[PDB]
Design an enzyme around this catalytic site. Structure first.
Site, PDB file in Angstrom:
ATOM      1  N   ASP A  11       0.361   1.546  -0.112  1.00 27.90           N
ATOM      2  CA  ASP A  11       1.151   2.392   1.101  1.00 27.90           C
ATOM      3  C   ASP A  11       0.572   4.052   0.768  1.00 27.90           C
ATOM      4  OD1 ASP A  11       2.589   3.940   3.091  1.00 27.90           O
ATOM      5  OD2 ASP A  11       4.417   3.096   2.495  1.00 27.90           O
ATOM      6  N   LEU A  53     -10.846  10.037  -4.947  1.00 25.77           N
ATOM      7  CA  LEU A  53     -11.199   8.881  -4.110  1.00 25.77           C
ATOM      8  C   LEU A  53     -10.355   9.212  -2.719  1.00 25.77           C
ATOM      9  CD1 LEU A  53     -10.396   6.157  -6.726  1.00 25.77           C
ATOM     10  CD2 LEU A  53     -12.705   6.704  -5.641  1.00 25.77           C
ATOM     11  N   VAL A  93      -5.772  10.924  -5.162  1.00 31.80           N
ATOM     12  CA  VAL A  93      -6.293  10.015  -6.049  1.00 31.80           C
ATOM     13  C   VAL A  93      -7.747  10.275  -6.745  1.00 31.80           C
ATOM     14  CG1 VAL A  93      -6.817   7.472  -6.539  1.00 31.80           C
ATOM     15  CG2 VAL A  93      -5.039   8.115  -4.893  1.00 31.80           C
ATOM     16  N   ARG A 129      -5.707  -0.477   6.924  1.00 33.90           N
ATOM     17  CA  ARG A 129      -5.945   1.163   6.165  1.00 33.90           C
ATOM     18  C   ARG A 129      -5.038   1.051   5.055  1.00 33.90           C
ATOM     19  NH1 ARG A 129      -2.975   1.753  10.827  1.00 33.90           N
ATOM     20  NH2 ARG A 129      -0.764   2.380  10.637  1.00 33.90           N
ATOM     21  N   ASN A 130      -3.975   0.250   4.804  1.00 28.86           N
ATOM     22  CA  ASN A 130      -3.042   0.360   3.619  1.00 28.86           C
ATOM     23  C   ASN A 130      -3.496  -0.910   2.576  1.00 28.86           C
ATOM     24  OD1 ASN A 130      -1.760   2.609   3.840  1.00 28.86           O
ATOM     25  ND2 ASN A 130      -0.561   1.832   5.573  1.00 28.86           N
ATOM     26  N   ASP A 166       4.825   0.126   7.021  1.00 27.35           N
ATOM     27  CA  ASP A 166       3.417   0.693   7.716  1.00 27.35           C
ATOM     28  C   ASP A 166       2.226  -0.273   7.245  1.00 27.35           C
ATOM     29  OD1 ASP A 166       1.669   2.096   9.009  1.00 27.35           O
ATOM     30  OD2 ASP A 166       1.490   3.617   7.324  1.00 27.35           O
TER      31      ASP A 166
HETATM   32  O1  LIG Z   1       0.398   2.663  -2.758  1.00 19.30           O
HETATM   33  C1  LIG Z   1       1.003   3.692  -2.989  1.00 19.30           C
HETATM   34  C2  LIG Z   1       0.300   5.078  -3.616  1.00 19.30           C
HETATM   35  C3  LIG Z   1      -0.609   5.021  -4.533  1.00 19.30           C
HETATM   36  C4  LIG Z   1      -0.319   5.272  -5.966  1.00 19.30           C
HETATM   37  C5  LIG Z   1      -0.935   5.356  -7.089  1.00 19.30           C
HETATM   38  C6  LIG Z   1      -2.302   4.948  -6.905  1.00 19.30           C
HETATM   39  C7  LIG Z   1      -2.864   4.452  -5.627  1.00 19.30           C
HETATM   40  C8  LIG Z   1      -4.004   4.105  -5.458  1.00 19.30           C
HETATM   41  C9  LIG Z   1      -5.215   3.821  -5.568  1.00 19.30           C
HETATM   42  C10 LIG Z   1      -6.589   3.355  -5.202  1.00 19.30           C
HETATM   43  C11 LIG Z   1      -7.482   3.905  -4.444  1.00 19.30           C
HETATM   44  C12 LIG Z   1      -8.777   3.471  -4.233  1.00 19.30           C
HETATM   45  C13 LIG Z   1      -9.473   2.624  -5.145  1.00 19.30           C
HETATM   46  N1  LIG Z   1      -8.314   1.949  -6.031  1.00 19.30           N
HETATM   47  C14 LIG Z   1      -7.098   2.438  -6.163  1.00 19.30           C
HETATM   48  C15 LIG Z   1      -2.003   4.638  -4.568  1.00 19.30           C
HETATM   49  N2  LIG Z   1       2.378   3.812  -2.840  1.00 19.30           N
HETATM   50  C16 LIG Z   1       3.612   2.891  -2.535  1.00 19.30           C
HETATM   51  C17 LIG Z   1       4.701   3.420  -2.385  1.00 19.30           C
HETATM   52  C18 LIG Z   1       5.606   2.679  -1.792  1.00 19.30           C
HETATM   53  C19 LIG Z   1       5.392   1.178  -1.824  1.00 19.30           C
HETATM   54  C20 LIG Z   1       3.984   0.609  -2.035  1.00 19.30           C
HETATM   55  C21 LIG Z   1       3.782  -0.611  -1.971  1.00 19.30           C
HETATM   56  F1  LIG Z   1       3.081  -1.408  -2.754  1.00 19.30           F
HETATM   57  F2  LIG Z   1       4.684  -1.412  -1.390  1.00 19.30           F
HETATM   58  F3  LIG Z   1       2.690  -1.011  -0.921  1.00 19.30           F
HETATM   59  C22 LIG Z   1       3.215   1.445  -2.392  1.00 19.30           C
END
Ligand SMILES: O=C(Cc1cccc(C#Cc2cccnc2)c1)Nc1cccc(C(F)(F)F)c1
Length: 302
Positions: free
Chosen positions: A173, A16, A24, A159-160, A155
């Protein structure tokens, strides 16, 4: 959390995306039913699984384990959640919901504002003005949750954000290293990478992020939504001009410039955006109030 997800049950299917210390993959679970709890809600179930990159260093590993710890703090309908982890042994995984409509920037980019409200068939690449509000309200609710934990995102941007079935939004994120959004970040060697076009003036000058700077970034993100992501914030200005703009907020002589009102954006809503960009942090609206306006007031015709 306490018990590892059975890694043997994952069948990897496609990539992905790829970040700084991980990537991912879409995966299938052969029998999803016997794994069900409150942390774990066609015929195969699909999940998204983040793993270590193949060039994994000790440093990336450490960042991955901390990411697991951070994400475990967060349980809200509009914040990304970990269904499961594999951290007792290798390979390390983070398992989350597969959000089939991808990130919100790409999603909104592929849509157009409805000419006439609710006159089209299902599936057409059109989106209504109330849907934009609904999208925005969800992000605000997600940010309200984060604020109650005194958790600062640092951030926030389309895009996030991730888009699921039936237009559910989840804040996530993905870091600052993705090739796709490199223009959104300002890099200087030996310094922290900065999304200056989303950043409150005091962060650009001091580098100190707070819940009030998250509100400023939410204002820019809301602008993005109402633009249907058709242009970069401050798109016709250079990075240096954008940084100079923060100095103008500081000196406070009325020479600072703002994002213009999007075509889809009514004046009342644009006044809300402007309040998010208030010079004084205390005067920027709280997320509980931003959510109220987006879920309700914004439905007014007077
Ligand atoms: O978001 C992340 C990273 C992360 C980790 C595991 C899986 C995915 C995905 C995915 C995906 C992509 C396409 C379609 N479906 C799902 C992304 N880390 C993170 C780190 C600190 C704080 C935060 C938050 F919640 F505060 F925003 C989030």
């Amino acid at each position: 959390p306490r018990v590892d997800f059975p890694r043997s049950r994952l069948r990897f299917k496609e990539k992905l995306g790829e970040g700084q210390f991980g990537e991912v993959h879409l995966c299938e679970v052969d029998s999803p039913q016997d794994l069900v709890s409150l942390d774990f809600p066609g015929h195969p179930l699909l999940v998204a699984v983040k793993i270590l990159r193949p060039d994994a260093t000790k440093n990336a590993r450490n960042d991955f384990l901390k990411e697991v710890k951070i994400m475990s703090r967060l349980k809200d309908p509009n914040i990304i959640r970990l269904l499961g982890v594999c951290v007792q042994d290798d390979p390390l995984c983070m398992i989350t919901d597969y959000m089939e409509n991808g990130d919100l920037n790409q999603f909104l980019s592929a849509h157009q504002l409805e000419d006439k409200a609710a006159e089209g068939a299902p599936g057409d690449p059109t989106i209504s003005y109330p849907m934009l509000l609904h999208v925005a309200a969800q992000i605000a609710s997600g940010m309200r949750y984060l604020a109650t934990l005194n958790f600062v995102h640092r951030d926030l941007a389309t895009r996030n954000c991730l888009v699921g079935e039936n237009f559910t939004i989840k804040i996530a994120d993905f870091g600052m290293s993705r090739n796709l959004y490199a223009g959104d970040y300002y890099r200087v060697q030996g310094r922290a990478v900065l999304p200056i076009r989303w950043m409150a003036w005091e962060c650009i000058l001091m580098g100190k992020f707070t819940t009030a700077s998250d509100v400023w970034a939410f204002g820019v993100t809301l602008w993005e939504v109402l633009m249907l992501c058709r242009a970069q914030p401050f798109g016709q200005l250079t990075d240096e001009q954008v940084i100079e703009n923060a100095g103008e907020f500081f000196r406070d002589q009325g020479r600072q410039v703002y994002l213009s009102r999007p075509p889809a954006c009514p004046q009342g809503l644009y006044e809300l955006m402007l309040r998010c960009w208030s010079r004084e942090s205390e005067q920027r609206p709280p997320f509980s109030q931003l959510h109220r306006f987006l879920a309700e007031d914004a439905l007014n015709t007077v």
